[PDB]
Subunit: 349 residues, 2 copies
């Protein structure tokens, strides 16, 4: 049952959706909860992770904060060769003070780069940005790529209730295409405009609301035509595609109906079907979904080259999940793509 690094089983295990935190940013969340400027999602999510005495919450916070020996030990213990790291949701996106947001993002990016310099064979970085300032975010995308060795950026879904399909956010996509790097749209809690019915049932987080928020965000980017404007752009999402691959037949059928009937101002003709974009511009990881039928379904729909392994450490750190993935009824060749070579291609490792 021992899980080992080194690839002796035929592939490296590259985990592509792995989280860290900085104490000063967590402290901002606590400040916002204390002063009443935190949104309902931040109260729910970070009220829990930063303050709950539960074993799950306390271990997640300890592990999030570590970018050294302890993290490496946890990777070694589960045979994870490399982890692609990003500042944990929601990043600096909810912060009202632009100067504070840019300062703390800069610090989090420098901290991550330092950690990758210490463990260059184990840690790979994705930058964090502050979409409330799109041109600054463009500057930081360039700095991450040029100076910090990062492989792309992670945006934690909406920024203060606004979505990346607005023309306002264009400089972010412009810069991503300039540096030729992927965008990972990671979940966040829904904004206050949407969260209420999920919050009241305890469904606002990873169990449901994360998938709603993130699937909605990817879908609206597809339907605004982001991939016609930027045909080279790759967007990555976790959690087996936030249900979009399973909804695909219905997405394309209803999208076509809406386009033809002129029902909506922001749903005009696209050069490809939604299926077409999934095959050429969208990439999926299995974070949180260590489940062979769903993985195989997604591989069939999108292509086995477009589906990657992710652990979602430390929110879902489970050695038996790694064992289950190693044991799937897949060819050695498919397994190697899923664990290793797809990530090497798409993140340009």
């Amino acid at each position: 049952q021992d899980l080992k690094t080194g690839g002796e089983q035929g592939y490296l295990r590259i985990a592509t959706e792995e989280a860290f935190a900085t104490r000063e940013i967590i402290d901002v969340y606590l400040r916002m909860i204390r002063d009443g400027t935190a949104d309902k999602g931040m109260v729910s999510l970070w009220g829990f992770y930063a303050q709950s005495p539960s074993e799950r919450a306390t271990q997640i916070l300890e592990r999030l904060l570590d970018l050294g020996e302890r993290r490496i030990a946890d990777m070694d213990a589960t045979g994870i060769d490399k982890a692609i790291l990003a500042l944990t949701s929601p990043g600096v996106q909810p912060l009202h003070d632009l100067d504070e947001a840019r300062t703390l993002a800069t610090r989090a990016n420098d901290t991550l780069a330092d950690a990758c310099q210490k463990y260059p064979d184990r840690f790979i970085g994705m930058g964090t940005v502050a979409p409330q300032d799109p041109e600054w975010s463009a500057r930081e995308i360039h700095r991450g790529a040029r100076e910090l060795g990062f492989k792309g950026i992670q945006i934690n879904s909406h920024t203060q209730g606004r979505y990346l399909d607005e023309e306002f956010f264009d400089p972010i996509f412009r810069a991503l295409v300039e540096v030729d790097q992927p965008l990972y749209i990671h979940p966040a809690t829904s904004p206050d405009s949407m969260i209420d019915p999920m919050l009241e049932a305890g469904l606002d987080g990873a169990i449901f609301g994360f998938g709603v928020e993130t699937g909605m965000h990817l879908l609206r980017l597809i339907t605004i035509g982001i991939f016609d404007k930027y045909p080279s752009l790759q967007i990555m999402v976790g959690h087996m595609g936030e249900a979009l691959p399973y909804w695909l037949y219905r997405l394309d059928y209803m999208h076509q109906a809406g386009v033809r009937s002129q029902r909506y101002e922001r749903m005009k003709p696209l050069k490809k079907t939604i299926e077409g974009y999934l095959k050429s511009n969208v990439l999926v990881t299995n974070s949180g979904v260590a489940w062979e039928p769903a993985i195989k379904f997604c591989q069939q729909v999108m292509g086995e080259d477009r589906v990657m392994y992710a652990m979602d450490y430390p929110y879902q750190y489970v050695a038996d999940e790694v064992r289950a993935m190693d044991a799937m009824d897949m060819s050695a060749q498919t397994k190697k793509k899923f664990f290793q070579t797809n990530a090497e291609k798409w993140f340009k490792l």
Copy 2:
């Protein structure tokens, strides 16, 4: 290869379509009244402002077919080889109506209208009752009236009622009644309530494309996590659109449900007697309305059991002869295909 889609079961199965819609003119007129007077919620403005007033080819044909409960509907069924249709008043029914007497009156008339049509075409039309969850005790009486007097086989509730969900204790009499008559509840989509709709509406995603699945999947999930099936172990809830993504999310649902329960994170997420997977296998039933897509059907048959997945057309919102032809030609055993088109529905609706 034939373009022929014939009634009569010569393929080896009847085609029983399990999520089919009709409208009444007087109820559509109430939606228009609410839109005009500003009492319609954003979902109604979006959905019914579209279907009742759009000049689009798609909307105009939909409205005509919805209103027919006779020879045209039968001809449309005959032309696509549909033997039987299970009919329900189209979403959101009378659920958004603030006047309780008007809601009960209009639901009663819609139920009586549907029952008359089923009596006229008894080998073709099967009815599901509509109710007014704003009044759960009246709704319970109407579930009984539909079962005993009108020959209905269950009820369809169009997800939320004025922003409230069925997991509230207030709605319990509806569940007591369903268990008493031993009939299934079909939770059909509706637009999200005003508390949730805004970001989807802006992007044109509030309807069938996405918001329907968000609203309905959320509603089913919150009923499972409140423990509805521990309270009422016999209760069957049906949903369409391949389970509103829940079967695909199952591993994540169970993992994060356990994490929530164990960490005592939320008041309304307490221990359940079965896993979410367990409830899908014993208490939830799925149709493929709007999802004429073999990989998704087969996935759902694997997760839930092939006995628990039924064919539905979603007429007239999705009336596509080519979809019936695709379903007929799936790489599925004759036995499984017959369960999917016919015998599962015969069992679960007690046809």
